[PDB]
């Protein structure tokens, strides 16, 4: 009774290796017409100096793009992170428009932007072999400023997880160390650019899944406020939920590369292909601004304790803000508790699971999702009753369960009401302390990896700006040291519940791994929050 | 068990009669202070030379107050639009920012626009002696911009209506002719606009409620994309309502005094005010642009036959763009009915009108509202009983009626994914054949009083936008001839139901009450819907520019 399924992942399996063998050899054919061509001068280049290089016509796109090609072939091999070759794009390469912001530059896309001719499958059988009839809207502006795209890279089955496995394509492992999750769900652009073959990726995020992976792979990350970009054509599997919206958004080695990315994408092509989203361009001035910060902190949410990584990240950070000028203020949110609990969770599945579960009727559940899928299958009675039972001695368990129940149009109503005044509520706070930014821990060192599916009161961090839409990015920082990991087995968390129990033995292991923080801007204003990031990057990372 | 609604009315009663008294003695106090202030001379000038003088300082800002006050309270005897003074404001006048692009301007305020220390009611006894404990976000950035706030302005009961009387301040009547309606539910402040007592005006809209009382008074208004300006602090009645979306905007007597205020509005001390509004400055060179315009044109929606008025308007406003070198093109959005009847009436009651319903408990229902709040209180069960019998007899009432029904969140996904899905396919034919704007009847003339209620089918030309959430406008163009009224004899609607046969009688003896058409731009894009507008409004009406 899962032929379908098998089925499925066997074209998959096949599709992907012939994917990987049409890389392979075009670039081997690249590479002997081209012998003399210093590779490696070229994949280490800045984004920025690349695109300068290609626009002066110093380098070519041919040789941009078969340069990363290979590259990407070879780290695929540790990493798993290509699902499919954009087999168009060496045409693509020569009809690209010259003075585009992007001319040449090869781009990597999560699976779920979609492509002409591609599945974006998201790791699920339903959606094997059903090929996209046209590029979503940030594709064809991304084609329209010049770029290359030239693969999709993995997610976890169905795209609702921070790991980055599914039963179609497997499972995709950090670059830094294979015991290790890469983050998600944009995992394999994480990987891939993290590795250093993409030089510029897309990802989406509803709980931290540009941010998760970025972190975790040592890579910046921005998701702006969720209607900044047109998610128009992208793939999805829950279709309505407007509570929390989806957000898209750019993964590359630098934090001008993002700022590249969003200006090259915030430009008439996008505004007026969906005009949904509001005609914003990019504010190039405040990205610029060298103007002392105030600047919110907090060194943990009091929800999710922080490994001792984490929390050293954040406090060197501070201080290294605080000498070079700006004014670091304590902030924390209010009622993370229930932003989290009852609003995030109330909004992802007012309807109890039942639309999302519909995406794997006859499919396997890939074990990095944990009990995900079984716990929301439940009838609402028995989530009720569990949740009743484990109040008084795992309160975070029994509230996750309570607020995962179907209702009625009229509670989401005073869902989506709550949500609104939780969000004016904190940007209340915010002017109250006078902030410009806000300056937060992200989630790290990597997980190993099937335990983020059993860890997810961990998503604290980062689903916070999910509901509240703000825009919110991440900047490694600094690396795990033999004292920051030992450190670990004095971690216990503040629940001690099974999340609390996960986490501290799937953060072990992990010095030499890379760890961020996470910079936070009040909505609309990404780039501001790129400012401070730009900032965070030039303080903690000088050489680059 | 009605005494507090007793209660309520009369003190309420109370508050106004006081208003109006203390209006009346600053007038006359000010008037034999300055003898010597030709009041006309400024009471008709254009907002926009207003400002200009107030800029250089060859008006006063008490005399501009003062003038504009007097005449409020003249108008507000044939009309009942003003619901409040907004007592705060002779302090404000002294205070006014000077370089602020508003400065000096007394603006009236539909009564949901909070302000401080003043009740806003919506006509219903529940809000009564529940004083705003702050001015709203738009009523902040209106005083930093120099602008004075006057007068809080009459609403229908709720809000939730295109007629405007409640139980508190009574019934608001057209200042051209009162037995008819002045629309609603911003019908205040297109009664007192709309008979010369005030310059500018701010006023909110989910199916219509901006565009009505405008073109039914004969002004100008503008409903922009729900989410350019700031809902924060505007009293409402339903929380949480996201499918179709509210949105708020100015009324003015031209369409340059709406430019004005859209450029005053958005600027850095709103969007710092609610960063939730993306800072989307107001593009001039847009607004002034002159280039030509294709423009999409429709004479009916086939849901709502117009009038032989508004048909005269939209076709004569066609021919005149098409002289002045526009090119005009026929389209007409897919799917009305299923636009209106299922996503506009799912979307605003998705709960099945209880949220609604609650702010009427214990409360008198206005006739205005007709058999609405009955209507609503039915038990799903018998709303689908009643929607399979009259199927086949009136299918557009058993479409209404059955999509009023409650229902599970699980079906407002998917209602809300329609509505997206719904939006892209209309964005889809407009760029499919290359439209910048488009041009739509407008409903006209004014009915009776208490009919708008019991025509609930027209709301179809004006909430088809709020269901697609474009900014779209309205510009007076023309006026009632003897000859359109007499033709109303002819009409007979699509349907021949209960709505069509209301509309026929209501819009009936209108000669010489103005009639427009409206003007739809894509989302965001206020300043070219303005720019149509405008263009509208030089060559239908030339001497307002
Ligand atoms: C169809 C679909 C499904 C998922 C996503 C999506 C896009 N971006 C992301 C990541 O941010 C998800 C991170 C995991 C969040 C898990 C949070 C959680 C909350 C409550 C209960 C369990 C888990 O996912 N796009 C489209
Ligand atoms: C709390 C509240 C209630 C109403 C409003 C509001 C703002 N603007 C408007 C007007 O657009 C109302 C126009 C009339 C719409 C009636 C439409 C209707 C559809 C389906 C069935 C019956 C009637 O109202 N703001 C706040
Ligand atoms: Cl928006």
Redesign the interface.
């Known amino acids: 009774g899962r032929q379908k399924a098998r089925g499925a992942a066997t074209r998959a399996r096949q599709k992907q290796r012939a994917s990987l063998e049409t890389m392979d050899k075009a670039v081997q054919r690249f590479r002997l017409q081209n012998p003399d061509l210093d590779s490696e001068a070229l994949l280490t280049l800045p984004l920025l100096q690349l695109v300068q290089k290609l626009q002066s016509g110093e380098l070519s796109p041919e040789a941009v793009f078969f340069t990363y090609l290979g590259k990407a072939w070879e780290v695929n091999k540790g990493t798993n992170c290509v699902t499919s070759y954009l087999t168009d794009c060496e045409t693509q390469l020569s009809q690209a428009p010259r003075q585009g912001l992007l001319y040449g530059v090869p781009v990597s896309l999560k699976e779920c932007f979609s492509y002409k001719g591609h599945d974006s499958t998201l790791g699920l059988s339903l959606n094997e072999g059903m090929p996209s009839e046209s590029d979503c809207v940030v594709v064809q502006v991304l084609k329209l400023q010049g770029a290359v795209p030239f693969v999709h890279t993995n997610v976890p089955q169905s795209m609702f997880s921070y790991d980055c496995s599914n039963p179609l394509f497997g499972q995709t492992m950090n670059p830094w160390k294979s015991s290790k999750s890469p983050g998600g769900s944009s995992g394999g652009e994480g990987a891939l650019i993290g590795s250093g073959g993409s030089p510029l990726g897309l990802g989406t995020d509803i709980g931290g899944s540009i941010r998760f992976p970025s972190a975790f792979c040592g890579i910046c990350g921005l998701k702006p406020t969720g209607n900044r970009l047109s998610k128009?054509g992208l793939k999805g599997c829950?279709?309505?939920?407007?509570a929390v919206q989806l957000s898209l958004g750019p993964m590359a080695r630098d934090v001008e590369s993002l700022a590249l990315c969003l200006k090259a994408l915030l430009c008439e092509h996008l505004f007026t292909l969906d005009?949904?989203?509001?005609?914003?361009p990019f504010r190039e001035e405040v990205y610029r601004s060298s103007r002392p910060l105030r600047v919110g902190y907090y060194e943990t949410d009091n929800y999710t304790m922080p490994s001792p990584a984490m929390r050293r990240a954040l406090i060197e950070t501070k201080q290294r803000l605080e000498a070079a000028g700006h004014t670091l203020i304590p902030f924390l949110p209010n009622n993370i508790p229930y932003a989290l609990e009852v609003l995030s969770t109330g909004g992802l599945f007012?309807?109890?699971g039942?639309?999302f579960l519909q995406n794997f009727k006859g499919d396997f559940v890939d074990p990095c999702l944990g009990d995900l899928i079984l716990i929301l299958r439940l009838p609402s009675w028995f989530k009720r009753l569990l949740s009743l039972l484990l109040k008084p001695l795992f309160p975070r368990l029994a509230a996750f369960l309570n607020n995962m129940r179907?209702?009625?149009?009229?509670?989401?109503?005073?869902?989506?009401?709550?949500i609104?005044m939780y969000?004016?509520s904190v940007?209340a706070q915010w002017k109250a302390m006078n902030l410009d930014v806000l300056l937060t821990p992200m989630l790290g060192p990597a997980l190993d990896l099937n335990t983020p599916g059993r860890a997810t009161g961990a998503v604290s961090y980062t689903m916070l700006y999910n509901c509240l839409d703000f825009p919110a990015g991440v900047v490694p920082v600094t690396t795990v040291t033999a004292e920051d990991d030992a450190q670990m087995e004095l971690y216990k968390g503040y629940f001690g519940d099974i999340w609390d129990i996960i986490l501290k033995k799937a953060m072990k292991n992990s010095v030499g791994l890379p760890v961020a923080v996470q910079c936070v801007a009040?909505?609309?204003?990404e780039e501001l929050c790129l400012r401070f990031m730009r900032e965070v990057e030039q303080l903690m990372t000088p050489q680059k």
């Open positions: 128009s829950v279709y309505g939920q407007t005009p949904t989203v509001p005609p914003l007012s309807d109890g039942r639309s179907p209702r009625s149009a009229e509670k989401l109503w005073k869902l989506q009401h709550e609104e969000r004016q940007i009040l909505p609309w204003q």
